Design a protein around this ligand. Structure first.
Ligand code: MET
Ligand code: MET
Ligand code: ZN
Ligand code: ZN
Lengths: 150, 149
């Protein structure tokens, strides 16, 4: 598990970081990015808020970046993982994430996909908190974080 | 897409192909919905799903080749897994069952729990994670069709 090899005490959130790159048999690269909102072990995003962030960024990352495969919350609740079909491009992903965070901070419309039909825990959302976490990231400023291994 | 699955019609627990993307050279990335609980009838506690993530990240990789990622769903009723390869729900179901047996029997320290290796090392619950694995095996897994809204 490559996740456990990053030295979580040495990164500086918020940031974007290439977490890993894998190739398919023919040679296509699948890049995975760590979209980190909070500093590891200094607090966590509430489950309702990260659930709303997942629904919003699922769509907003796709709006600003091609080849997105998935946007998922991390179990540690300090960030999200995003998988993209394409060569590593930390700067491009940082710009996309910034654009998507502006969309997220200003999202005043209903949360996309929230209903008993469309979501598996439809009552567990918190748009006010998700918007504020996006604004906090923008307020602090993103950067491309080097992977510091253990 | 995730919002097009009719969540009131699926039958947890199950394994379901949630999507498949073709890569530029003709290869495929498959996405799987590894559902533990019935949508909207309760959720896995955050600490418990954080432990399930640490355990299944390694156990799924022990039983299935090409795993790219194993992550918890924001709705906390299951996990999403992305795999390089053609769809193979039967193979993923068999791999998930093996991984759940490993999880249910995990009586050693949770892997990766420290300030160095985890972003929230104080939020774990091995006992709850092992019981969730047991409950899925007790109910029994099956391949769930995608019922669209
Ligand atoms: C539940 S919103 C969709 C999130 C999913 N992990 C993906 O980006 O497709
Ligand atoms: C924090 S355990 C590892 C997590 C990551 N989702 C993986 O599948 O690579
Ligand atoms: Zn949801
Ligand atoms: Zn962790």
């Amino acid at each position: 598990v490559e996740s456990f090899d990053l030295d979580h005490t040495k990164v500086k959130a918020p940031y974007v970081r290439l977490a890993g790159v894998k190739t398919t048999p023919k040679g296509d690269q699948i890049s995975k990015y760590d979209l980190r909102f909070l500093q590891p072990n200094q607090g966590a995003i509430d489950p309702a808020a990260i659930h709303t962030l997942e629904h919003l960024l699922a769509g907003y990352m796709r709006d600003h970046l091609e080849g997105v495969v998935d946007v998922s919350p991390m179990g540690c609740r300090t960030g999200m993982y995003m998988a993209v079909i394409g060569e590593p491009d930390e700067q491009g992903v940082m710009k996309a994430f910034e654009a998507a965070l502006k969309d997220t901070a200003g999202h005043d419309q209903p949360i996309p996909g929230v209903s008993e039909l469309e979501c598996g825990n439809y009552r567990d959302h918190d748009l006010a908190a998700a918007r504020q976490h996006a604004r906090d990231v923008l307020d602090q400023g993103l950067k491309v974080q080097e992977t510091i291994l253990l």
